[PDB]
């Protein structure tokens, strides 16, 4: 809507207070005009019809429990936009400042979040397995990254290309978490997963096997569930990414870490310049090697570490 840009204050899912960009026109709306063509947050009102109603508030104060998921979805979408713009020089997910839209309070007790090809959607969780999903910055960044992938590589959501699609979202979801410096780690969804159990998460990049996910190509899932194991086999790539950044010895292969910043630069280049809709793991390795070569030289330590990481997880 058309109005005056202002700043409101609220409390997120985890009870933390933060300022959010809103727009004033009779009501205060969750519409941030400071980033590209805007960031819009909608209320799905426990229904499944999207996007729902643009979030309207009477006093620009969002401290009600019902407001929490909206506050975080709105705020973290902004942080993610800032990451791509400041670190990778990318304006929004399409590279042309496309408006970012999110709907919260989707359905009832919905334990999931997703990008539906046009916008992000967040469930509130059942309160046991998950609390409102927008409370996790790595979750929000994971979802927005699916949009980036759709507009660039276009990796098909099935089998190996789908596992890569998933890993990319986990990787950048994690890099954004580090960017915001919000208790950063290499685990996925720890902030909103099982509120009754501390120390766990949905997936782990440092040690995928911790939750039964493969950490080597020889242990890849070949079944048909989960679209050919897109959330399962992503563990193989997540481990490779973790090794490239942090280093370590995996299955007898030693990898010298090159840091998070270079990891992000290498994968972003691979994603936007070399990957295609049907790229498989082996092609991802070639793309990553070529990207590191473009950026640091064929005889650089960076290129060496990328090769070692993929050798470590058995991807030739
Ligand atoms: Ca209010
Ligand atoms: Ca964390
Ligand atoms: Ca995390
Ligand atoms: Ca937990
Ligand atoms: Zn995903």
Swiss-Prot record:
Q: Please give the catalytic activity noted in the UniProt record.
A: Preferential cleavage: Xaa-|-Leu > Xaa-|-Phe
Its required cofactor(s), as named, are:
Ca(2+); Zn(2+)
- Could you state one GO cellular component term attached to this entry? extracellular region
Molecular functions per Gene Ontology: metal ion binding; metalloendopeptidase activity
Q: Which residues bind Ca(2+) 4?
A: 193-194, 197, 200
User: Where, in this chain's numbering, is Ca(2+) 2 bound?
Assistant: 138, 177, 185, 187, 190
Annotated Zn(2+) binding lies at 142, 146, 166
- What does the UniProt entry say about where the protein is found? Secreted
What job does the chain carry out?
Extracellular zinc metalloprotease.
Recorded family membership: Belongs to the peptidase M4 family.
In its UniProt entry, what is this protein called?
Answer: Thermolysin
Native organism = Bacillus thermoproteolyticus
Could you read off the lineage of the organism from its UniProt record? Bacteria, Bacillati, Bacillota, Bacilli, Bacillales
- What gene makes this protein? npr
- Shown residues within the full chain: 233 to 548 of 548
């Amino acid at each position: 809507i058309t109005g005056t840009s202002t700043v409101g204050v609220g409390r997120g899912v985890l009870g933390d207070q933060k300022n959010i960009n809103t727009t004033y026109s009779t009501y205060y709306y969750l519409q941030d005009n400071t980033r590209g063509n805007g960031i819009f947050t909608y209320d799905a009102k426990y229904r499944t019809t999207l996007p729902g109603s643009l979030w309207a508030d009477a006093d620009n104060q969002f401290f009600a429990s019902y407001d929490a998921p909206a506050v975080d979805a709105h705020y973290y979408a902004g942080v993610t936009y800032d990451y791509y713009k400041n670190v990778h020089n990318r304006l929004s997910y399409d590279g042309n400042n496309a408006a970012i839209r999110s709907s919260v309070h989707y359905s009832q007790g919905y334990n999931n979040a997703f990008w539906n090809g046009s916008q992000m959607v967040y469930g509130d969780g059942d309160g046991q397995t998950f609390i409102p999903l927008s409370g996790g910055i790595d979750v929000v960044a994971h979802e927005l990254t699916h949009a980036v992938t759709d507009y660039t590589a276009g990796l098909i959501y099935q089998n190996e290309s789908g596992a890569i699609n998933e890993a990319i979202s986990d990787i950048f979801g994690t890099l954004v978490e580090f960017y915001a410096n919000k208790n950063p780690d290499w685990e996925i969804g720890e902030d909103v997963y099982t509120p009754g159990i501390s120390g766990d998460s949905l997936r782990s990049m440092s040690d995928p096997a911790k939750y039964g996910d493969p950490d080597h190509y020889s242990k890849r899932y070949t079944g048909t569930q989960d679209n050919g194991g897109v959330h399962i086999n992503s563990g193989i790539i997540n481990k490779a990414a973790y090794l490239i950044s942090q280093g370590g010895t995996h299955y007898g292969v030693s990898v010298v870490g090159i840091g998070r910043d270079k990891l992000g630069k290498i994968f972003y280049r691979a994603l936007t310049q070399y990957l295609t809709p049907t790229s498989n793991f082996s092609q991802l390795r070639a793309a990553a090697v070529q990207s590191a070569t473009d950026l640091y030289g064929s005889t650089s330590q960076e290129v060496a570490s990328v090769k070692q990481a993929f050798d470590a997880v058995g991807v030739k």
